[PDB]
Write a structure and sequence with these properties.
Elements (H helix, E strand, L loop, with lengths): L2 E4 L4 E4 L5 E3 L1 E10 L4 E6 L8 E7 L2 E7 L5 E8 L6 E8 L2 E6 L5 E4 L7 E3 L2 E4 L20 E9 L2 E2 L16
Antiparallel strand pairs: 1-14, 2-13, 3-12, 4-9, 4-14, 5-6, 5-13, 6-7, 7-8, 9-10, 10-11, 14-15
The structure holds calcium ion (CA).
Calcium ion (CA) binds next to β12.
Organism: Gallus gallus (Chicken)
Function: This released fragment is important for agrin signaling and to exert a maximal dendritic filopodia-inducing effect. All 'B' splice variants of this fragment also show an increase in the number of filopodia.
Protein name: Agrin C-terminal 22 kDa fragment
């Protein structure tokens, strides 16, 4: 079941099986797009003070960004994502270290600054864009740009995410 996004489509989900302290994050999914800029996924409370970890298309390539409390670190892929062809994306973080693998490229890795190791969230996860966009002039434009393309087989922390009935904001479902 592939879902389509037209640039104004954003779905809200909450972590499946309070204030939680997460030591790790695991994201898998496939996407299809022609976009050079766009927010794919944002996990965090979404507030100015909140920690986060996100996936986005910045200037033609997928990149992973996260701030656990000691400033953000970015991991940028070397694969052009706007081929309009389905492409797999494997992303994970264990404490400070992270890995981003788009397609069959060699995994790009890195560590966020010394300090925080936990992502403090309430379980919120956004797809295609995010409600609280207080970042239009605080991060690259891609992060406040709705995604345009398709997404399928999304797996979060080893658990399959059901794009349609798991959504909470009763969105307008359009398939690819
Ligand atoms: Ca933290």
């Amino acid at each position: 079941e592939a879902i389509a996004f037209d640039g104004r489509t954003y779905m809200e989900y909450h972590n499946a099986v309070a204030e939680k302290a997460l030591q790790s994050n695991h994201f898998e999914l496939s996407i299809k797009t022609e976009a050079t800029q766009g927010l794919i996924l944002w996990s965090g409370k979404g507030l100015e003070r909140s920690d986060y970890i996100a996936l986005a298309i910045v200037d033609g390539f997928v990149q992973m960004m996260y701030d656990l409390g000691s400033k953000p670190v970015v991991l940028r892929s070397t694969v052009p994502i706007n081929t309009n062809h389905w492409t797999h994306i494997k992303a994970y973080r264990v404490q400070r270290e992270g890995s981003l693998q788009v397609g069959n490229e060699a995994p790009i890795t890195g560590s966020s600054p010394l300090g925080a190791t936990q992502l403090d969230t309430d379980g919120a996860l956004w797809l295609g864009g995010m409600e609280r966009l207080s970042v239009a002039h605080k991060l690259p434009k891609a992060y406040s740009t709705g995604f345009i393309g398709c997404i399928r087989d999304v797996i979060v922390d080893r658990q399959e995410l059901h794009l349609v009935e798991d959504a909470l904001n009763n969105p307008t479902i359009l398939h690819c």
